[PDB]
Amino acid sequence: GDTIFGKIIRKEIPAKIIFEDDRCLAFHDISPQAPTHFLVIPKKHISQISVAEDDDESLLGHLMIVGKKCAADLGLNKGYRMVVNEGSDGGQSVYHVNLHVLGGRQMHWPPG
Amino acid sequence: RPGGDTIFGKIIRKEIPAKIIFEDDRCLAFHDISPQAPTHFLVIPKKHISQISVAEDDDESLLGHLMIVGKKCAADLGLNKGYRMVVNEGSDGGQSVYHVNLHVLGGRQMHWPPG
Ligand SMILES: COC(=O)[C@H](C)NP(=O)(O)OC[C@H]1O[C@@H](n2cnc3c(N)ncnc32)[C@H](O)[C@@H]1O
Ligand SMILES: [Cl-]
């Protein structure tokens, strides 16, 4: 099933894009929870981390490397938090794997 | 002493105790001593990387492996309703051990924002 993140990848609806390559896209979250809050998503439609395959390991790690490079480019020199939500208890809001990167304020503990 | 002298390096070398869930040549999963959810464990690389902001491009497969191990351990622990994965970077992340560590939290409803 297609999601709004598919529409963003296909450029059918606008988003504030930070970075793109052949396999992922980073863009500011439309409902930001911190002064900087962006998502890194794969272009491959993996619905949730629980169904990711072993062959996806490099792609998932690529999301994190892109995330940390984007965080540095956006000036998050005091730190940040990365989050992946799975399912109902995880609070996953879109069934397309997405890495949240949040910073620009003190992040608290517990993380929700 | 491979793995560094953070407490996680010592856990890797079996010098201080841990409740281990899974171990392979690349990583180790073990329960957090200060759980923030009914299930709360960490997945760490055996290679010492101090924080995500200094990970190298060639660490991509290793970082992805942490997530794959995290989701497999979550399934093995019966977290069938979901869970949240977290990596904290630096002061604003609240990082307290400077050895890259992926948290997996589940067994309760997680809230938004994630801290
Ligand atoms: C306030 O936020 C933070 O401190 C974040 C979570 N720091 P962070 O560096 O992201 O996570 C480190 C975690 O490592 C756990 N820990 C520390 N010592 C041991 C140990 N000996 N065995 C098992 N777990 C241990 C702490 O309870 C933290 O949850
Ligand atoms: Cl989500």
PDB file of all heavy atoms in Angstrom, chain A residues 4-5 8 14-18 25-41 74 83 85 91 93-94 96 98-103, chain B residues 112-114:
ATOM      1  N   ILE A   4       1.912   8.456   2.021  1.00  0.00           N
ATOM      2  CA  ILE A   4       2.272   9.835   1.738  1.00  0.00           C
ATOM      3  C   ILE A   4       3.766   9.973   1.478  1.00  0.00           C
ATOM      4  O   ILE A   4       4.186  10.848   0.711  1.00  0.00           O
ATOM      5  CB  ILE A   4       1.764  10.755   2.864  1.00  0.00           C
ATOM      6  CG1 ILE A   4       1.889  12.216   2.439  1.00  0.00           C
ATOM      7  CG2 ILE A   4       2.508  10.476   4.173  1.00  0.00           C
ATOM      8  CD1 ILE A   4       0.890  13.130   3.121  1.00  0.00           C
ATOM      9  N   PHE A   5       4.593   9.119   2.091  1.00  0.00           N
ATOM     10  CA  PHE A   5       6.026   9.192   1.809  1.00  0.00           C
ATOM     11  C   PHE A   5       6.346   8.748   0.383  1.00  0.00           C
ATOM     12  O   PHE A   5       7.289   9.265  -0.231  1.00  0.00           O
ATOM     13  CB  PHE A   5       6.826   8.403   2.845  1.00  0.00           C
ATOM     14  CG  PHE A   5       6.824   9.022   4.228  1.00  0.00           C
ATOM     15  CD1 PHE A   5       7.356   8.325   5.306  1.00  0.00           C
ATOM     16  CD2 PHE A   5       6.304  10.291   4.451  1.00  0.00           C
ATOM     17  CE1 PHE A   5       7.353   8.882   6.574  1.00  0.00           C
ATOM     18  CE2 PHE A   5       6.301  10.846   5.725  1.00  0.00           C
ATOM     19  CZ  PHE A   5       6.835  10.132   6.778  1.00  0.00           C
ATOM     20  N   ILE A   8       5.796  11.778  -1.629  1.00  0.00           N
ATOM     21  CA  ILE A   8       6.893  12.727  -1.498  1.00  0.00           C
ATOM     22  C   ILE A   8       8.077  12.296  -2.360  1.00  0.00           C
ATOM     23  O   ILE A   8       8.673  13.119  -3.065  1.00  0.00           O
ATOM     24  CB  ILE A   8       7.259  12.901  -0.013  1.00  0.00           C
ATOM     25  CG1 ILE A   8       6.143  13.684   0.702  1.00  0.00           C
ATOM     26  CG2 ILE A   8       8.604  13.594   0.136  1.00  0.00           C
ATOM     27  CD1 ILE A   8       6.297  13.743   2.236  1.00  0.00           C
ATOM     28  N   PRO A  14       4.595  18.526  -2.257  1.00  0.00           N
ATOM     29  CA  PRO A  14       5.840  19.177  -1.854  1.00  0.00           C
ATOM     30  C   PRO A  14       6.314  18.735  -0.479  1.00  0.00           C
ATOM     31  O   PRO A  14       5.538  18.315   0.385  1.00  0.00           O
ATOM     32  CB  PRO A  14       5.465  20.664  -1.834  1.00  0.00           C
ATOM     33  CG  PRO A  14       4.009  20.669  -1.562  1.00  0.00           C
ATOM     34  CD  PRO A  14       3.468  19.474  -2.294  1.00  0.00           C
ATOM     35  N   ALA A  15       7.624  18.844  -0.302  1.00  0.00           N
ATOM     36  CA  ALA A  15       8.283  18.682   0.981  1.00  0.00           C
ATOM     37  C   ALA A  15       9.543  19.531   0.939  1.00  0.00           C
ATOM     38  O   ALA A  15      10.048  19.858  -0.140  1.00  0.00           O
ATOM     39  CB  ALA A  15       8.636  17.215   1.254  1.00  0.00           C
ATOM     40  N   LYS A  16      10.048  19.894   2.116  1.00  0.00           N
ATOM     41  CA  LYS A  16      11.283  20.668   2.209  1.00  0.00           C
ATOM     42  C   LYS A  16      12.429  19.666   2.229  1.00  0.00           C
ATOM     43  O   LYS A  16      12.810  19.143   3.282  1.00  0.00           O
ATOM     44  CB  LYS A  16      11.273  21.570   3.437  1.00  0.00           C
ATOM     45  CG  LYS A  16      10.083  22.525   3.496  1.00  0.00           C
ATOM     46  CD  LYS A  16      10.238  23.540   4.622  1.00  0.00           C
ATOM     47  CE  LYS A  16      10.077  22.892   5.990  1.00  0.00           C
ATOM     48  NZ  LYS A  16      10.395  23.838   7.099  1.00  0.00           N
ATOM     49  N   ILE A  17      12.965  19.383   1.046  1.00  0.00           N
ATOM     50  CA  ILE A  17      13.974  18.344   0.871  1.00  0.00           C
ATOM     51  C   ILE A  17      15.333  18.877   1.298  1.00  0.00           C
ATOM     52  O   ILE A  17      15.731  19.987   0.920  1.00  0.00           O
ATOM     53  CB  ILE A  17      13.989  17.848  -0.584  1.00  0.00           C
ATOM     54  CG1 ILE A  17      12.662  17.154  -0.900  1.00  0.00           C
ATOM     55  CG2 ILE A  17      15.160  16.893  -0.813  1.00  0.00           C
ATOM     56  CD1 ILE A  17      12.472  16.811  -2.370  1.00  0.00           C
ATOM     57  N   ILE A  18      16.043  18.081   2.089  1.00  0.00           N
ATOM     58  CA  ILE A  18      17.373  18.407   2.576  1.00  0.00           C
ATOM     59  C   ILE A  18      18.446  17.732   1.738  1.00  0.00           C
ATOM     60  O   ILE A  18      19.487  18.326   1.453  1.00  0.00           O
ATOM     61  CB  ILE A  18      17.493  17.952   4.044  1.00  0.00           C
ATOM     62  CG1 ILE A  18      16.488  18.697   4.911  1.00  0.00           C
ATOM     63  CG2 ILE A  18      18.934  18.095   4.544  1.00  0.00           C
ATOM     64  CD1 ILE A  18      16.181  17.951   6.184  1.00  0.00           C
ATOM     65  N   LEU A  25      15.928   9.673   0.710  1.00  0.00           N
ATOM     66  CA  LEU A  25      15.507  11.063   0.663  1.00  0.00           C
ATOM     67  C   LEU A  25      15.415  11.566   2.096  1.00  0.00           C
ATOM     68  O   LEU A  25      14.886  10.866   2.967  1.00  0.00           O
ATOM     69  CB  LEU A  25      14.121  11.149   0.014  1.00  0.00           C
ATOM     70  CG  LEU A  25      13.542  12.543  -0.206  1.00  0.00           C
ATOM     71  CD1 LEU A  25      14.325  13.287  -1.266  1.00  0.00           C
ATOM     72  CD2 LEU A  25      12.065  12.453  -0.578  1.00  0.00           C
ATOM     73  N   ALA A  26      15.927  12.764   2.350  1.00  0.00           N
ATOM     74  CA  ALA A  26      15.827  13.402   3.662  1.00  0.00           C
ATOM     75  C   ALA A  26      15.052  14.697   3.517  1.00  0.00           C
ATOM     76  O   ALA A  26      15.309  15.466   2.586  1.00  0.00           O
ATOM     77  CB  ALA A  26      17.202  13.703   4.251  1.00  0.00           C
ATOM     78  N   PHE A  27      14.110  14.934   4.430  1.00  0.00           N
ATOM     79  CA  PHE A  27      13.232  16.091   4.325  1.00  0.00           C
ATOM     80  C   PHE A  27      12.729  16.482   5.707  1.00  0.00           C
ATOM     81  O   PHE A  27      12.637  15.651   6.618  1.00  0.00           O
ATOM     82  CB  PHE A  27      12.062  15.849   3.356  1.00  0.00           C
ATOM     83  CG  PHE A  27      11.223  14.644   3.684  1.00  0.00           C
ATOM     84  CD1 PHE A  27      10.047  14.778   4.405  1.00  0.00           C
ATOM     85  CD2 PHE A  27      11.601  13.385   3.252  1.00  0.00           C
ATOM     86  CE1 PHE A  27       9.269  13.671   4.704  1.00  0.00           C
ATOM     87  CE2 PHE A  27      10.832  12.272   3.550  1.00  0.00           C
ATOM     88  CZ  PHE A  27       9.663  12.415   4.271  1.00  0.00           C
ATOM     89  N   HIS A  28      12.429  17.767   5.874  1.00  0.00           N
ATOM     90  CA  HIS A  28      11.958  18.240   7.167  1.00  0.00           C
ATOM     91  C   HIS A  28      10.583  17.657   7.477  1.00  0.00           C
ATOM     92  O   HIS A  28       9.733  17.530   6.593  1.00  0.00           O
ATOM     93  CB  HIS A  28      11.902  19.769   7.185  1.00  0.00           C
ATOM     94  CG  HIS A  28      13.248  20.413   7.139  1.00  0.00           C
ATOM     95  ND1 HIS A  28      14.024  20.583   8.265  1.00  0.00           N
ATOM     96  CD2 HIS A  28      13.974  20.899   6.104  1.00  0.00           C
ATOM     97  CE1 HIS A  28      15.168  21.154   7.924  1.00  0.00           C
ATOM     98  NE2 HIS A  28      15.157  21.367   6.621  1.00  0.00           N
ATOM     99  N   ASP A  29      10.374  17.279   8.735  1.00  0.00           N
ATOM    100  CA  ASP A  29       9.077  16.746   9.131  1.00  0.00           C
ATOM    101  C   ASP A  29       8.029  17.852   9.122  1.00  0.00           C
ATOM    102  O   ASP A  29       8.282  18.977   9.561  1.00  0.00           O
ATOM    103  CB  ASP A  29       9.179  16.130  10.526  1.00  0.00           C
ATOM    104  CG  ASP A  29       8.034  15.200  10.844  1.00  0.00           C
ATOM    105  OD1 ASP A  29       6.943  15.677  11.179  1.00  0.00           O
ATOM    106  OD2 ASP A  29       8.247  13.970  10.791  1.00  0.00           O
ATOM    107  N   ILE A  30       6.838  17.524   8.627  1.00  0.00           N
ATOM    108  CA  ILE A  30       5.767  18.515   8.570  1.00  0.00           C
ATOM    109  C   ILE A  30       5.196  18.852   9.947  1.00  0.00           C
ATOM    110  O   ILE A  30       4.555  19.902  10.112  1.00  0.00           O
ATOM    111  CB  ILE A  30       4.692  18.062   7.570  1.00  0.00           C
ATOM    112  CG1 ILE A  30       3.781  19.240   7.213  1.00  0.00           C
ATOM    113  CG2 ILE A  30       3.900  16.904   8.139  1.00  0.00           C
ATOM    114  CD1 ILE A  30       2.887  18.997   6.031  1.00  0.00           C
ATOM    115  N   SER A  31       5.405  17.991  10.945  1.00  0.00           N
ATOM    116  CA  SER A  31       4.942  18.208  12.315  1.00  0.00           C
ATOM    117  C   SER A  31       6.156  18.169  13.243  1.00  0.00           C
ATOM    118  O   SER A  31       6.334  17.211  14.003  1.00  0.00           O
ATOM    119  CB  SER A  31       3.925  17.141  12.716  1.00  0.00           C
ATOM    120  OG  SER A  31       3.519  17.290  14.070  1.00  0.00           O
ATOM    121  N   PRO A  32       7.005  19.194  13.202  1.00  0.00           N
ATOM    122  CA  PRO A  32       8.296  19.104  13.904  1.00  0.00           C
ATOM    123  C   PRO A  32       8.141  19.108  15.416  1.00  0.00           C
ATOM    124  O   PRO A  32       7.353  19.871  15.985  1.00  0.00           O
ATOM    125  CB  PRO A  32       9.056  20.341  13.413  1.00  0.00           C
ATOM    126  CG  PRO A  32       7.985  21.302  12.995  1.00  0.00           C
ATOM    127  CD  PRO A  32       6.862  20.460  12.464  1.00  0.00           C
ATOM    128  N   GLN A  33       8.926  18.253  16.067  1.00  0.00           N
ATOM    129  CA  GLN A  33       8.908  18.092  17.516  1.00  0.00           C
ATOM    130  C   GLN A  33      10.124  18.706  18.184  1.00  0.00           C
ATOM    131  O   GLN A  33      10.296  18.559  19.398  1.00  0.00           O
ATOM    132  CB  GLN A  33       8.827  16.607  17.867  1.00  0.00           C
ATOM    133  CG  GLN A  33       7.628  15.919  17.257  1.00  0.00           C
ATOM    134  CD  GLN A  33       6.334  16.479  17.786  1.00  0.00           C
ATOM    135  OE1 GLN A  33       6.126  16.530  19.000  1.00  0.00           O
ATOM    136  NE2 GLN A  33       5.460  16.922  16.888  1.00  0.00           N
ATOM    137  N   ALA A  34      10.993  19.342  17.415  1.00  0.00           N
ATOM    138  CA  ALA A  34      12.188  20.000  17.911  1.00  0.00           C
ATOM    139  C   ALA A  34      12.545  21.084  16.914  1.00  0.00           C
ATOM    140  O   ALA A  34      12.035  21.073  15.786  1.00  0.00           O
ATOM    141  CB  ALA A  34      13.347  18.995  18.050  1.00  0.00           C
ATOM    142  N   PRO A  35      13.410  22.032  17.289  1.00  0.00           N
ATOM    143  CA  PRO A  35      13.750  23.110  16.344  1.00  0.00           C
ATOM    144  C   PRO A  35      14.281  22.596  15.020  1.00  0.00           C
ATOM    145  O   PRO A  35      14.035  23.217  13.976  1.00  0.00           O
ATOM    146  CB  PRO A  35      14.781  23.944  17.115  1.00  0.00           C
ATOM    147  CG  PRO A  35      14.400  23.738  18.560  1.00  0.00           C
ATOM    148  CD  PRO A  35      13.938  22.297  18.641  1.00  0.00           C
ATOM    149  N   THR A  36      14.986  21.466  15.028  1.00  0.00           N
ATOM    150  CA  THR A  36      15.298  20.717  13.819  1.00  0.00           C
ATOM    151  C   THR A  36      14.717  19.324  13.977  1.00  0.00           C
ATOM    152  O   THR A  36      14.989  18.641  14.971  1.00  0.00           O
ATOM    153  CB  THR A  36      16.806  20.631  13.578  1.00  0.00           C
ATOM    154  OG1 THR A  36      17.320  21.948  13.339  1.00  0.00           O
ATOM    155  CG2 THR A  36      17.105  19.751  12.364  1.00  0.00           C
ATOM    156  N   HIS A  37      13.909  18.911  13.009  1.00  0.00           N
ATOM    157  CA  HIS A  37      13.310  17.582  13.027  1.00  0.00           C
ATOM    158  C   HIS A  37      13.113  17.189  11.574  1.00  0.00           C
ATOM    159  O   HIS A  37      12.277  17.778  10.877  1.00  0.00           O
ATOM    160  CB  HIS A  37      11.987  17.596  13.790  1.00  0.00           C
ATOM    161  CG  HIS A  37      11.293  16.271  13.840  1.00  0.00           C
ATOM    162  ND1 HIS A  37      10.063  16.112  14.440  1.00  0.00           N
ATOM    163  CD2 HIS A  37      11.656  15.042  13.397  1.00  0.00           C
ATOM    164  CE1 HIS A  37       9.686  14.849  14.340  1.00  0.00           C
ATOM    165  NE2 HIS A  37      10.636  14.176  13.714  1.00  0.00           N
ATOM    166  N   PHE A  38      13.890  16.221  11.107  1.00  0.00           N
ATOM    167  CA  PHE A  38      13.783  15.766   9.731  1.00  0.00           C
ATOM    168  C   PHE A  38      13.718  14.249   9.698  1.00  0.00           C
ATOM    169  O   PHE A  38      13.967  13.575  10.701  1.00  0.00           O
ATOM    170  CB  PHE A  38      14.899  16.336   8.828  1.00  0.00           C
ATOM    171  CG  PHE A  38      16.296  15.882   9.179  1.00  0.00           C
ATOM    172  CD1 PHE A  38      16.841  14.751   8.581  1.00  0.00           C
ATOM    173  CD2 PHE A  38      17.081  16.608  10.064  1.00  0.00           C
ATOM    174  CE1 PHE A  38      18.139  14.343   8.886  1.00  0.00           C
ATOM    175  CE2 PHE A  38      18.381  16.202  10.362  1.00  0.00           C
ATOM    176  CZ  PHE A  38      18.902  15.079   9.761  1.00  0.00           C
ATOM    177  N   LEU A  39      13.332  13.722   8.544  1.00  0.00           N
ATOM    178  CA  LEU A  39      13.214  12.297   8.315  1.00  0.00           C
ATOM    179  C   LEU A  39      14.176  11.899   7.216  1.00  0.00           C
ATOM    180  O   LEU A  39      14.412  12.662   6.272  1.00  0.00           O
ATOM    181  CB  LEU A  39      11.812  11.927   7.838  1.00  0.00           C
ATOM    182  CG  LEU A  39      10.663  12.373   8.739  1.00  0.00           C
ATOM    183  CD1 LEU A  39       9.337  11.901   8.162  1.00  0.00           C
ATOM    184  CD2 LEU A  39      10.848  11.833  10.135  1.00  0.00           C
ATOM    185  N   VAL A  40      14.713  10.688   7.325  1.00  0.00           N
ATOM    186  CA  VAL A  40      15.459  10.045   6.245  1.00  0.00           C
ATOM    187  C   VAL A  40      14.726   8.757   5.914  1.00  0.00           C
ATOM    188  O   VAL A  40      14.508   7.924   6.803  1.00  0.00           O
ATOM    189  CB  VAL A  40      16.924   9.768   6.619  1.00  0.00           C
ATOM    190  CG1 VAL A  40      17.697   9.350   5.374  1.00  0.00           C
ATOM    191  CG2 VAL A  40      17.553  10.993   7.260  1.00  0.00           C
ATOM    192  N   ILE A  41      14.324   8.602   4.656  1.00  0.00           N
ATOM    193  CA  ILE A  41      13.553   7.430   4.246  1.00  0.00           C
ATOM    194  C   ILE A  41      14.224   6.734   3.070  1.00  0.00           C
ATOM    195  O   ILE A  41      14.848   7.398   2.229  1.00  0.00           O
ATOM    196  CB  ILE A  41      12.095   7.787   3.914  1.00  0.00           C
ATOM    197  CG1 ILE A  41      11.974   8.592   2.621  1.00  0.00           C
ATOM    198  CG2 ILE A  41      11.466   8.562   5.061  1.00  0.00           C
ATOM    199  CD1 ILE A  41      10.531   8.864   2.245  1.00  0.00           C
ATOM    200  N   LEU A  74      23.072  20.801   9.036  1.00  0.00           N
ATOM    201  CA  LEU A  74      22.059  21.666   9.619  1.00  0.00           C
ATOM    202  C   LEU A  74      22.512  22.291  10.933  1.00  0.00           C
ATOM    203  O   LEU A  74      21.706  22.937  11.611  1.00  0.00           O
ATOM    204  CB  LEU A  74      20.749  20.895   9.799  1.00  0.00           C
ATOM    205  CG  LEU A  74      20.033  20.520   8.499  1.00  0.00           C
ATOM    206  CD1 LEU A  74      18.925  19.517   8.773  1.00  0.00           C
ATOM    207  CD2 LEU A  74      19.473  21.751   7.794  1.00  0.00           C
ATOM    208  N   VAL A  83      15.541   8.278  15.824  1.00  0.00           N
ATOM    209  CA  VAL A  83      14.436   7.425  16.259  1.00  0.00           C
ATOM    210  C   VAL A  83      13.866   6.663  15.071  1.00  0.00           C
ATOM    211  O   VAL A  83      13.630   7.243  14.006  1.00  0.00           O
ATOM    212  CB  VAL A  83      13.313   8.254  16.917  1.00  0.00           C
ATOM    213  CG1 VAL A  83      12.156   7.349  17.345  1.00  0.00           C
ATOM    214  CG2 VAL A  83      13.844   9.075  18.085  1.00  0.00           C
ATOM    215  N   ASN A  85      10.413   4.219  14.709  1.00  0.00           N
ATOM    216  CA  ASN A  85       9.236   3.693  15.388  1.00  0.00           C
ATOM    217  C   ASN A  85       8.729   2.453  14.668  1.00  0.00           C
ATOM    218  O   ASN A  85       8.665   2.424  13.435  1.00  0.00           O
ATOM    219  CB  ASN A  85       8.114   4.719  15.359  1.00  0.00           C
ATOM    220  CG  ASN A  85       8.481   6.013  16.049  1.00  0.00           C
ATOM    221  OD1 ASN A  85       9.151   6.022  17.082  1.00  0.00           O
ATOM    222  ND2 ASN A  85       8.032   7.127  15.476  1.00  0.00           N
ATOM    223  N   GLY A  91       4.479   3.828  18.152  1.00  0.00           N
ATOM    224  CA  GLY A  91       3.947   5.095  17.686  1.00  0.00           C
ATOM    225  C   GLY A  91       4.240   5.385  16.233  1.00  0.00           C
ATOM    226  O   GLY A  91       4.289   6.559  15.842  1.00  0.00           O
ATOM    227  N   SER A  93       3.815   6.338  12.664  1.00  0.00           N
ATOM    228  CA  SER A  93       2.747   7.141  12.077  1.00  0.00           C
ATOM    229  C   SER A  93       2.566   6.919  10.583  1.00  0.00           C
ATOM    230  O   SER A  93       1.499   7.252  10.055  1.00  0.00           O
ATOM    231  CB  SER A  93       2.992   8.629  12.343  1.00  0.00           C
ATOM    232  OG  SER A  93       4.229   9.045  11.794  1.00  0.00           O
ATOM    233  N   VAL A  94       3.580   6.392   9.892  1.00  0.00           N
ATOM    234  CA  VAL A  94       3.514   6.095   8.462  1.00  0.00           C
ATOM    235  C   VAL A  94       4.181   4.747   8.254  1.00  0.00           C
ATOM    236  O   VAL A  94       5.302   4.533   8.728  1.00  0.00           O
ATOM    237  CB  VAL A  94       4.221   7.158   7.592  1.00  0.00           C
ATOM    238  CG1 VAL A  94       4.122   6.799   6.101  1.00  0.00           C
ATOM    239  CG2 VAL A  94       3.652   8.553   7.857  1.00  0.00           C
ATOM    240  N   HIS A  96       6.029   3.307   6.215  1.00  0.00           N
ATOM    241  CA  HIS A  96       7.177   3.362   5.315  1.00  0.00           C
ATOM    242  C   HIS A  96       8.326   3.692   6.254  1.00  0.00           C
ATOM    243  O   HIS A  96       8.281   4.727   6.923  1.00  0.00           O
ATOM    244  CB  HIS A  96       6.983   4.481   4.276  1.00  0.00           C
ATOM    245  CG  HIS A  96       8.068   4.558   3.244  1.00  0.00           C
ATOM    246  ND1 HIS A  96       7.804   4.497   1.892  1.00  0.00           N
ATOM    247  CD2 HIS A  96       9.408   4.720   3.364  1.00  0.00           C
ATOM    248  CE1 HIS A  96       8.942   4.595   1.224  1.00  0.00           C
ATOM    249  NE2 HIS A  96       9.928   4.733   2.091  1.00  0.00           N
ATOM    250  N   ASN A  98      11.135   5.044   8.333  1.00  0.00           N
ATOM    251  CA  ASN A  98      11.618   6.411   8.349  1.00  0.00           C
ATOM    252  C   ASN A  98      12.418   6.646   9.618  1.00  0.00           C
ATOM    253  O   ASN A  98      12.004   6.253  10.716  1.00  0.00           O
ATOM    254  CB  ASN A  98      10.469   7.429   8.165  1.00  0.00           C
ATOM    255  CG  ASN A  98       9.443   7.418   9.298  1.00  0.00           C
ATOM    256  OD1 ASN A  98       9.454   8.302  10.157  1.00  0.00           O
ATOM    257  ND2 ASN A  98       8.509   6.475   9.252  1.00  0.00           N
ATOM    258  N   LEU A  99      13.581   7.244   9.451  1.00  0.00           N
ATOM    259  CA  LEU A  99      14.470   7.587  10.544  1.00  0.00           C
ATOM    260  C   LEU A  99      14.248   9.055  10.900  1.00  0.00           C
ATOM    261  O   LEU A  99      14.452   9.934  10.052  1.00  0.00           O
ATOM    262  CB  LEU A  99      15.914   7.363  10.098  1.00  0.00           C
ATOM    263  CG  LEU A  99      16.982   7.795  11.102  1.00  0.00           C
ATOM    264  CD1 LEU A  99      17.015   6.858  12.288  1.00  0.00           C
ATOM    265  CD2 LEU A  99      18.354   7.858  10.430  1.00  0.00           C
ATOM    266  N   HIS A 100      13.816   9.319  12.130  1.00  0.00           N
ATOM    267  CA  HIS A 100      13.689  10.683  12.626  1.00  0.00           C
ATOM    268  C   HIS A 100      15.026  11.154  13.166  1.00  0.00           C
ATOM    269  O   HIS A 100      15.724  10.402  13.850  1.00  0.00           O
ATOM    270  CB  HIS A 100      12.700  10.732  13.792  1.00  0.00           C
ATOM    271  CG  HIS A 100      11.302  10.375  13.425  1.00  0.00           C
ATOM    272  ND1 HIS A 100      10.303  11.316  13.315  1.00  0.00           N
ATOM    273  CD2 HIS A 100      10.724   9.177  13.172  1.00  0.00           C
ATOM    274  CE1 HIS A 100       9.172  10.716  12.987  1.00  0.00           C
ATOM    275  NE2 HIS A 100       9.401   9.417  12.892  1.00  0.00           N
ATOM    276  N   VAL A 101      15.372  12.408  12.888  1.00  0.00           N
ATOM    277  CA  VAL A 101      16.523  13.067  13.489  1.00  0.00           C
ATOM    278  C   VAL A 101      16.030  14.364  14.110  1.00  0.00           C
ATOM    279  O   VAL A 101      15.467  15.213  13.404  1.00  0.00           O
ATOM    280  CB  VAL A 101      17.650  13.326  12.473  1.00  0.00           C
ATOM    281  CG1 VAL A 101      18.861  13.906  13.174  1.00  0.00           C
ATOM    282  CG2 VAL A 101      18.005  12.046  11.731  1.00  0.00           C
ATOM    283  N   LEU A 102      16.212  14.508  15.424  1.00  0.00           N
ATOM    284  CA  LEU A 102      15.692  15.639  16.187  1.00  0.00           C
ATOM    285  C   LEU A 102      16.824  16.311  16.948  1.00  0.00           C
ATOM    286  O   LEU A 102      17.630  15.633  17.596  1.00  0.00           O
ATOM    287  CB  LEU A 102      14.624  15.189  17.201  1.00  0.00           C
ATOM    288  CG  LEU A 102      13.473  14.352  16.647  1.00  0.00           C
ATOM    289  CD1 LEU A 102      13.680  12.856  16.908  1.00  0.00           C
ATOM    290  CD2 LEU A 102      12.161  14.824  17.235  1.00  0.00           C
ATOM    291  N   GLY A 103      16.871  17.635  16.896  1.00  0.00           N
ATOM    292  CA  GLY A 103      17.876  18.358  17.642  1.00  0.00           C
ATOM    293  C   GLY A 103      17.523  19.823  17.744  1.00  0.00           C
ATOM    294  O   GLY A 103      16.432  20.247  17.364  1.00  0.00           O
TER     295      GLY A 103
ATOM    296  N   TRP B 112       4.678  10.500  21.974  1.00  0.00           N
ATOM    297  CA  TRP B 112       5.291  11.477  21.080  1.00  0.00           C
ATOM    298  C   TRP B 112       5.186  12.820  21.782  1.00  0.00           C
ATOM    299  O   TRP B 112       4.166  13.092  22.416  1.00  0.00           O
ATOM    300  CB  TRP B 112       4.542  11.485  19.750  1.00  0.00           C
ATOM    301  CG  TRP B 112       5.352  11.912  18.571  1.00  0.00           C
ATOM    302  CD1 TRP B 112       5.122  12.992  17.770  1.00  0.00           C
ATOM    303  CD2 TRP B 112       6.522  11.268  18.051  1.00  0.00           C
ATOM    304  NE1 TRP B 112       6.072  13.055  16.781  1.00  0.00           N
ATOM    305  CE2 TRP B 112       6.946  12.010  16.933  1.00  0.00           C
ATOM    306  CE3 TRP B 112       7.250  10.129  18.420  1.00  0.00           C
ATOM    307  CZ2 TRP B 112       8.068  11.654  16.180  1.00  0.00           C
ATOM    308  CZ3 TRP B 112       8.367   9.778  17.673  1.00  0.00           C
ATOM    309  CH2 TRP B 112       8.760  10.539  16.568  1.00  0.00           C
ATOM    310  N   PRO B 113       6.227  13.665  21.727  1.00  0.00           N
ATOM    311  CA  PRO B 113       7.525  13.494  21.067  1.00  0.00           C
ATOM    312  C   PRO B 113       8.398  12.452  21.778  1.00  0.00           C
ATOM    313  O   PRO B 113       8.120  12.093  22.928  1.00  0.00           O
ATOM    314  CB  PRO B 113       8.152  14.888  21.191  1.00  0.00           C
ATOM    315  CG  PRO B 113       7.561  15.450  22.424  1.00  0.00           C
ATOM    316  CD  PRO B 113       6.138  14.966  22.416  1.00  0.00           C
ATOM    317  N   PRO B 114       9.404  11.970  21.111  1.00  0.00           N
ATOM    318  CA  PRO B 114      10.269  10.931  21.695  1.00  0.00           C
ATOM    319  C   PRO B 114      11.337  11.567  22.575  1.00  0.00           C
ATOM    320  O   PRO B 114      12.553  11.507  22.301  1.00  0.00           O
ATOM    321  CB  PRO B 114      10.846  10.259  20.445  1.00  0.00           C
ATOM    322  CG  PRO B 114      10.992  11.389  19.478  1.00  0.00           C
ATOM    323  CD  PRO B 114       9.783  12.277  19.719  1.00  0.00           C
TER     324      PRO B 114
END
